[PDB]
Structure 1
Amino acid sequence: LADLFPGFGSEWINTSSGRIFARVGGDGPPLLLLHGFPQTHVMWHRVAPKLAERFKVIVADLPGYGWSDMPESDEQHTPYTKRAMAKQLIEAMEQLGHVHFALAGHNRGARVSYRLALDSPGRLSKLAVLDILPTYEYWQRMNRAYALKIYHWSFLAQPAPLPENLLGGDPDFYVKAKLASWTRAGDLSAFDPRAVEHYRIAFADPMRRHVMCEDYRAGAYADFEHDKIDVEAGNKIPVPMLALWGASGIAQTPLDVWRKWASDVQGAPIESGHFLPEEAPDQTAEALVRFFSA
Structure 2
Amino acid sequence: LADLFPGFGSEWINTSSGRIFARVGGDGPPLLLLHGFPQTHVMWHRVAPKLAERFKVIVADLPGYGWSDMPESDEQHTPYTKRAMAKQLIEAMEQLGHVHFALAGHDRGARVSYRLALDSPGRLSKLAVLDILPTYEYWQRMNRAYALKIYHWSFLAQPAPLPENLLGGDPDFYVKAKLASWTRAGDLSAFDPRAVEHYRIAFADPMRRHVMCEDYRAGAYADFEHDKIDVEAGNKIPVPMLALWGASGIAQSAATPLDVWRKWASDVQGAPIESGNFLPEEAPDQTAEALVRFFSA
Q: TM-score range by the shorter chain?
A: over 0.9
| 1:7 Cα deviation after fit | 1.5
Q: Distance in 1 between matches of 2:135 and 2:26?
A: 32
Deviations 1:78-128 (A, max 9, x none): 000000000000000000000000000000000000000000000000000
Deviations 1:176-208 (A, max 9, x none): 000000000100000000000000000000000
Deviations 1:18-65 (A, max 9, x none): 000000000000000000000000000000001000000000000000
Please list every run of at least 4 consecutive aligned residues from structure 1 whose deviation after the TM superposition is greater than 6 angstroms: none
Q: Secondary structure at the match of 1:260?
A: helix
Q: Distance in 1 between matches of 2:273 and 2:154?
A: 28
| 1:274 Cα deviation after fit | 0.5
Q: Distance in 1 between matches of 2:131 and 2:210?
A: 24
Q: Distance in 1 between matches of 2:105 and 2:128?
A: 6
Q: Distance in 2 between matches of 1:33 and 1:146?
A: 29
Equivalent residue pairs, number: 294
Identity of aligned residues (%): 99
Unaligned runs of 5+ in 1: none
Q: Distance in 2 between matches of 1:144 and 1:50?
A: 42
Q: Distance in 2 between matches of 1:92 and 1:5?
A: 20
Structure-2-length-normalised TM-score: 0.99
Q: Secondary structure at the match of 1:22?
A: strand
Q: Distance in 2 between matches of 1:17 and 1:250?
A: 31
Q: Secondary structure at the match of 1:251?
A: helix
Q: Secondary structure at the match of 2:213?
A: helix
Deviations 1:190-233 (A, max 9, x none): 00000000000000000000000000000000000000000011
2:290 — aligned with what? 287
Q: Distance in 2 between matches of 1:83 and 1:125?
A: 19
Q: Distance in 2 between matches of 1:155 and 1:204?
A: 19
Unaligned runs of 5+ in 2: none
| 1:283 Cα deviation after fit | 0.3
1:94 — aligned with what? 94
Structure-1-length-normalised TM-score: 1.00
| 1:250 Cα deviation after fit | 1.2
Q: Distance in 2 between matches of 1:243 and 1:186?
A: 23
| 1:6 Cα deviation after fit | 1.3
| 1:161 Cα deviation after fit | 0.3
Provide the alpha-carbon RMSD of the alignment.
Answer: 0.4
**Aligned counterpart for 2:280 among listed residues 256, 277, 281:** 277
